[PDB]
Amino acid sequence: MAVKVEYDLKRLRNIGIAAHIDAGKTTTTERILYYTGRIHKIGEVHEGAATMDFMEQERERGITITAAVTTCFWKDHRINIIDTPGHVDFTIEVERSMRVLDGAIVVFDSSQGVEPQSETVWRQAEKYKVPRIAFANKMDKTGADLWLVIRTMQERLGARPVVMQLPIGREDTFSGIIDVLRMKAYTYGNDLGTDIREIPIPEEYLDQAREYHEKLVEVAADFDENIMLKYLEGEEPTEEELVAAIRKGTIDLKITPVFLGSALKNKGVQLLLDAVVDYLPSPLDIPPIKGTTPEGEVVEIHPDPNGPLAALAFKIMADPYVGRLTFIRVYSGTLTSGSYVYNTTKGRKERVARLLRMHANHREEVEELKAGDLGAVVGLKETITGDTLVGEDAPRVILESIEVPEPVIDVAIEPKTKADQEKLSQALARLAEEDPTFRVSTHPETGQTIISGMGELHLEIIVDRLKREFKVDANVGKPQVAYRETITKPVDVEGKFIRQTGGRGQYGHVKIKVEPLPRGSGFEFVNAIVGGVIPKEYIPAVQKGIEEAMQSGPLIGFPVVDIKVTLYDGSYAEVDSSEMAFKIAGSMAIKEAVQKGDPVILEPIMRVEVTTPEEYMGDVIGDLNARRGQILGMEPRGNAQVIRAFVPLAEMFGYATDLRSKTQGRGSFVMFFDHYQEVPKQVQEKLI
């Protein structure tokens, strides 16, 4: 539609943002919305629920978060800010977004470049197959070298930037834009110097431009055989042919545009918005597509709001103004205001008062929400994230199959006055819905939490969250190891218990041989007996006394596993003997035999296979030996070299920053616990 009900979505521009600053997204976004919408409110600097600790990091390294939805109009071209604000750690919503969006957009202040985190956002952009651009804004601000960013693209992805412009001046001197294919420039006036005068290209950029009209016809021939065939023929194709090809090519992600300039003093900006429309599409410029039913039919999701509804619920806040804003994305179908609207994976209609699209710090109210669209509901004052919704009219599609952040920094946690535990299970209950950047698990002995999460940065963001919202006090324990205890040498003992209680004497005597035994036996009892002496009558108790002194091991008192017990001798006489006496007598016997049979505690032993360069072996080898590594071989993976090793759990627990530092030369790694092995003995003895 070219009528509103659909048209805001039918001209929409799904952009997914990574940015640095100075220009960047957050430094730029409000007054550049002033330069075409003549208003605007962003709200990311700096927003809770967490961030006032790691706000400075957020800005450089992804960009600032909380601005995610925006609609604005250039000449009925609805020009849009859409999800993925900046986060590189929190990438459930990035995975959701790359399947949704069309433009993955890197913003610079022109002296910035491609970071680790930029590389990560390209891999995520890659995974769900988006077109992308870069724009070097603030070319009139120092350090501004376009060609390293071109160079780095050529280098880093091995691949094709495409030069969209030449500038006139650079870092310290920018003042005009050269179109390199139409071979002409435009210069930009004042403080508000969107004042354009179409000047020539000066000689100094003519040749790179000419190469580039040539490269831009070249590039155009790459998406339309008529332009190649005319190029081939001896025509050079014409602008319009090229304009039509570039759209084809861009939506097929066959290019990566690199732009420059400086929108800072308004310069040219309104006219640029027309190139957005030209080469990128709407989310309604795709058809009905498939998700699979609960009975296993592939099933039509409709990019066509007229069709079957399909929705994901992704973001819950509580509010004073509605009480509760519940943010939802519709994938297909039309959800209308003033109604009760359907959740399939709950099974119910809940009551919509108003339908809104929620921006950073503010609402805009709407009649309806459609196939590809997002917004916030008024009404529904308990409805939750993480259900899958399809309509009353729909087949029951799959919309969601996204992969989650995953850990590399482990923390055991303990609240301390128990009042901080009280407002901790509240704080944990909140963080548990909200945070896919950790993994939680319960030591249930204590009832304590052992978190693993998603990086130093993730743990910073937690910390950040803690200082703001939680108001909780806690002692964070170590990343820590599990045990077993065991005998190593066999030793041969006796147990006696002869004392009076209950009128008469109580008398237990047993003679055991206690041995090391292989695993998954647990206990093993051999009765050399042949009844009497250490008699059969008293055995289940006499075995019971061993069974309970297995549970306390003889080092720090952790369970002692797999030992072979041969019961051979003893004595008894009932008027003075008892089976419990015999139990206690058996109980006594063992502790000494296992102790003199040289016991040890066992710590969980990991097997690790690590992809590295092979002379990066001499980078890694001192860390690996400190980390107690024992090489099992060196095997290439992909292309690059996987060193195998066996490692006891306890030394790895610092790593995560150094970890992104260790993930070199087509880097990767796997890890599993395999078996227990013994804890360094001198240290071991200290724990007791």
Side-chain angles (χ1 to χ4, degrees):
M1 296 194 198
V3 60
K4 186 245 69 187
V5 16
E6 199 202 75
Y7 86 1
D8 286 346
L9 187 66
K10 189 46 191 180
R11 273 77 52 96
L12 199 119
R13 290 299 179 279
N14 299 281
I15 56 153
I17 321 88
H20 309 261
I21 34 65
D22 292 289
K25 112 165 192 290
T26 321
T27 342
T28 304
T29 298
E30 190 251 50
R31 241 301 164 280
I32 239 282
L33 266 161
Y34 268 86
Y35 313 147
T36 201
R38 194 33 48 161
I39 202 85
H40 192 53
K41 307 189 283 193
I42 55 171
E44 307 190 287
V45 171
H46 285 267
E47 277 305 297
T51 210
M52 302 302 290
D53 283 271
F54 292 109
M55 47 160 199
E56 189 54 81
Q57 282 194 126
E58 188 165 87
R59 272 166 77 79
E60 188 206 299
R61 217 168 289 148
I63 203 48
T64 354
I65 283 90
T66 293
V69 177
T70 290
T71 199
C72 173
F73 258 143
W74 173 241
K75 303 189 314 204
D76 232 58
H77 174 37
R78 199 89 268 218
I79 49 172
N80 294 99
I81 299 178
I82 286 291
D83 214 10
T84 306
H87 51 213
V88 197
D89 186 72
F90 191 101
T91 45
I92 49 155
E93 305 301 302
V94 188
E95 286 256 328
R96 206 185 297 115
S97 299
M98 295 315 175
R99 301 149 84 137
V100 165
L101 64 85
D102 311 272
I105 317 293
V106 176
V107 207
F108 306 127
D109 197 303
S110 302
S111 39
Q112 283 142 13
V114 49
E115 290 289 292
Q117 61 76 224
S118 203
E119 174 164 323
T120 321
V121 307
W122 55 244
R123 302 290 181 166
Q124 220 311 291
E126 294 167 332
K127 171 181 192 184
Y128 305 109
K129 300 300 181 282
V130 297
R132 44 203 81 142
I133 74 176
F135 201 118
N137 192 28
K138 288 170 84 217
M139 183 55 63
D140 42 23
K141 195 233 69 294
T142 54
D145 177 346
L146 209 271
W147 320 108
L148 79 78
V149 176
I150 286 298
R151 185 189 306 122
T152 48
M153 194 302 174
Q154 301 162 113
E155 295 173 350
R156 190 180 202 121
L157 305 288
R160 185 202 191 155
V162 62
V163 185
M164 297 303 297
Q165 298 152 289
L166 274 147
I168 291 158
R170 206 177 50 72
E171 86 176 53
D172 50 15
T173 35
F174 176 72
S175 63
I177 289 300
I178 288 136
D179 196 295
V180 283
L181 169 270
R182 304 146 180 91
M183 292 304 282
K184 55 152 169 198
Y186 335 84
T187 183
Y188 286 107
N190 69 302
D191 294 77
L192 292 134
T194 196
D195 184 11
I196 177 266
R197 277 121 308 103
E198 196 180 271
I199 40 161
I201 308 179
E203 184 300 295
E204 313 91 85
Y205 321 98
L206 203 59
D207 297 287
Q208 187 260 262
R210 108 177 60 274
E211 277 170 53
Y212 252 72
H213 77 62
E214 181 200 56
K215 272 91 250 58
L216 291 171
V217 200
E218 275 163 24
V219 170
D222 191 32
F223 314 130
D224 197 281
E225 185 49 31
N226 185 265
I227 299 179
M228 188 43 207
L229 190 277
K230 293 179 161 201
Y231 220 24
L232 184 77
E233 203 59 64
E235 178 169 353
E236 174 200 59
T238 70
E239 201 179 317
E240 293 63 51
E241 311 180 69
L242 320 184
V243 163
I246 282 23
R247 188 192 178 83
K248 171 57 155 67
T250 304
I251 296 183
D252 284 354
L253 71 144
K254 303 275 176 62
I255 27 172
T256 302
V258 171
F259 291 80
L260 53 288
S262 179
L264 184 47
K265 284 95 77 170
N266 303 43
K267 304 202 146 191
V269 303
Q270 310 80 5
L271 294 178
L272 181 53
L273 298 179
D274 292 301
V276 184
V277 78
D278 205 343
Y279 308 112
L280 285 154
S282 103
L284 283 175
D285 289 359
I286 51 163
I289 30 142
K290 235 58 167 175
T292 296
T293 60
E295 60 264 61
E297 327 158 77
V298 88
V299 102
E300 202 97 298
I301 312 165
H302 273 59
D304 173 29
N306 319 280
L309 188 154
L312 224 281
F314 53 16
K315 324 177 199 286
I316 300 312
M317 180 230 296
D319 196 18
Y321 183 115
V322 285
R324 164 60 160 255
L325 286 165
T326 292
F327 223 137
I328 187 152
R329 178 174 161 72
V330 176
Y331 291 62
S332 71
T334 306
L335 202 158
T336 316
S337 197
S339 76
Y340 268 77
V341 290
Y342 176 55
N343 200 299
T344 307
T345 54
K346 298 271 163 284
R348 166 184 165 91
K349 311 223 219 188
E350 204 48 69
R351 186 232 283 271
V352 52
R354 299 123 67 161
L355 293 179
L356 332 167
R357 323 187 192 286
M358 189 68 178
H359 304 159
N361 60 351
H362 66 282
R363 294 156 200 78
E364 45 165 53
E365 351 200 300
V366 300
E367 305 175 272
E368 70 293 90
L369 170 79
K370 279 191 173 283
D373 201 4
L374 44 63
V377 70
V378 178
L380 307 93
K381 310 189 195 184
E382 69 313 275
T383 295
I384 67 191
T385 184
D387 286 283
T388 282
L389 295 84
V390 315
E392 310 97 336
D393 62 344
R396 282 58 189 120
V397 293
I398 304 180
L399 301 317
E400 188 89 292
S401 48
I402 71 163
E403 275 67 63
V404 189
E406 202 68 51
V408 293
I409 181 168
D410 189 88
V411 278
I413 55 157
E414 299 101 55
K416 63 143 61 56
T417 64
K418 215 292 190 167
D420 33 52
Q421 188 179 313
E422 263 64 299
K423 28 159 161 179
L424 184 67
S425 53
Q426 310 312 291
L428 177 57
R430 310 161 203 148
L431 189 67
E433 178 163 276
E434 298 179 40
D435 197 274
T437 64
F438 73 152
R439 295 296 160 68
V440 183
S441 55
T442 292
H443 287 189
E445 87 293 324
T446 36
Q448 83 150 120
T449 303
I450 316 288
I451 280 161
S452 343
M454 264 54 142
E456 345 77 281
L457 176 57
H458 156 69
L459 216 309
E460 275 172 2
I461 299 172
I462 296 298
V463 163
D464 210 335
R465 181 58 184 270
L466 153 88
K467 270 183 270 184
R468 237 65 58 218
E469 195 287 276
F470 302 167
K471 308 163 183 83
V472 175
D473 190 3
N475 290 33
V476 185
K478 219 168 76 54
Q480 45 197 266
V481 299
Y483 300 154
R484 314 268 81 217
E485 296 190 24
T486 187
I487 190 172
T488 60
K489 187 186 88 210
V491 169
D492 188 294
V493 292
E494 183 259 317
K496 204 152 268 89
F497 178 79
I498 303 195
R499 290 218 179 175
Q500 179 276 143
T501 316
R504 47 151 279 194
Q506 299 303 296
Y507 143 37
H509 182 194
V510 320
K511 289 195 185 80
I512 71 176
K513 186 186 315 304
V514 193
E515 296 199 39
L517 184 64
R519 173 77 72 262
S521 312
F523 176 26
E524 182 178 305
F525 176 70
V526 188
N527 208 216
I529 143 172
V530 85
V533 179
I534 27 345
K536 301 295 208 163
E537 178 65 32
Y538 290 160
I539 304 301
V542 168
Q543 276 188 303
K544 202 60 55 278
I546 306 303
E547 293 165 345
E548 62 181 25
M550 292 169 67
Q551 310 312 302
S552 48
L555 287 324
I556 66 98
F558 193 114
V560 56
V561 280
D562 298 77
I563 67 275
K564 189 272 298 187
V565 182
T566 303
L567 176 50
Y568 68 70
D569 181 66
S571 65
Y572 83 108
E574 66 316 302
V575 74
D576 203 87
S577 290
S578 67
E579 180 177 10
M580 296 307 156
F582 248 86
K583 176 178 179 282
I584 290 159
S587 206
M588 290 154 91
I590 175 149
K591 308 194 168 60
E592 67 160 284
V594 182
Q595 172 289 294
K596 284 167 285 173
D598 295 307
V600 69
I601 314 182
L602 308 179
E603 111 181 57
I605 315 308
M606 322 307 294
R607 212 190 81 206
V608 215
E609 297 85 92
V610 193
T611 317
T612 170
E614 206 185 90
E615 161 268 38
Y616 201 97
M617 185 203 304
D619 291 267
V620 96
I621 200 82
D623 199 3
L624 182 66
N625 292 353
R627 274 63 187 252
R628 298 189 281 189
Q630 155 55 22
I631 311 164
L632 300 177
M634 316 199 173
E635 31 164 345
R637 184 196 276 157
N639 57 65
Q641 176 57 285
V642 179
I643 300 181
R644 311 174 53 66
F646 246 124
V647 195
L649 185 58
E651 299 293 324
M652 279 78 95
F653 298 146
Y655 236 131
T657 184
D658 196 55
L659 202 70
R660 183 199 303 107
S661 301
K662 250 82 175 205
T663 43
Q664 320 300 318
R666 198 225 65 109
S668 68
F669 26 60
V670 278
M671 187 193 287
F672 47 98
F673 160 63
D674 190 64
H675 53 279
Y676 297 88
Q677 207 52 259
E678 57 177 73
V679 165
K681 249 304 185 197
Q682 137 288 155
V683 199
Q684 193 253 258
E685 294 307 300
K686 307 185 179 173
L687 294 171
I688 306 170

